[PDB]
Design a protein around this nucleic acid. Structure first.
Length: 174
RNA sequence: CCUCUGGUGUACCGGUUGUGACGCCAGUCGCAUCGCCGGGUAGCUAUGUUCGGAAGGGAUAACCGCUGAAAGCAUCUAAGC
């Protein structure tokens, strides 16, 4: 596995400590935890870390590749973090962050109130744009998917909630 | 379930035909589908009255995912959620 062979780099401020199976990653943004598969071993020499299979199994190489990918994402998150940039399209569709709760008006007969979980922050510079920032890539993606699910893009006008980097299929009636 | 609206209610009240009897008048009783007819207390009862299938947790089906390699990409899946 080319990924599993590739070495991940500790920037500087982040500290990665293995405790048996339960590897922990510390950084400026916060604390993250990741478990290890029985076939996976992690060796931290210098700044770099090496994920290598315990045995020569194909499953072991697979698990090593995923383990390295997750740890690389965790390190990048604790060092710098990720952001999402959700967008709204359609007349009357609006969003506003108030405290930790995002209030959305998406053409229904009732407003929608979405409570962000701990670790994700949101802001609306404009009424039709939402910025989500987090250290946990998986949790950030889950939050973005949940928010998008309230009103998905439709092909005839593109109205709804979308990712900025999202291709929208379009057609027309008749 | 029986407060209300009704049905029934042959041991509750009344009108009335024929006949027989209580010595007779008066007053009553037997029999005639409870003789026939008009009402009707409780109980039972529906066509009458009230109530119920409200709300919420957990695991899922099809389906929709997040992150993610095998397979440097992609990928809901193989680990994990």
């Amino acid at each position: 596995s080319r990924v599993a062979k590739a070495p991940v780099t500790v920037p500087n401020g982040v500290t990665v400590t293995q405790n048996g199976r339960q590897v922990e990653v510390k950084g400026s943004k916060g604390t993250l935890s990741f478990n290890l598969h029985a076939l996976v071993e992690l060796k931290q020499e210098e700044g770099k870390l090496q994920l290598a299979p315990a045995k020569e199994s194909k499953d072991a190489w697979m698990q090593a590749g995923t383990a390295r990918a997750v740890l690389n994402n965790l390190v990048k998150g604790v060092s710098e973090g990720f952001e999402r940039k959700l967008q709204l399209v359609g007349v009357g569709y609006k969003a506003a962050v108030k405290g930790t709760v995002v209030n959305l008006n998406l053409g229904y007969s009732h407003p929608i109130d979405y409570a962000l979980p701990e670790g994700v922050t949101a802001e609306t510079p404009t009424a039709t744009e939402i910025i989500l920032k987090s250290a946990n890539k998986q949790l950030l993606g889950q939050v973005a998917a949940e928010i998008r699910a309230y009103r998905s893009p439709e092909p005839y006008k593109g109205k709804g909630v979308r990712y900025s980097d999202e291709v929208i299929l379009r057609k027309e009636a008749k």
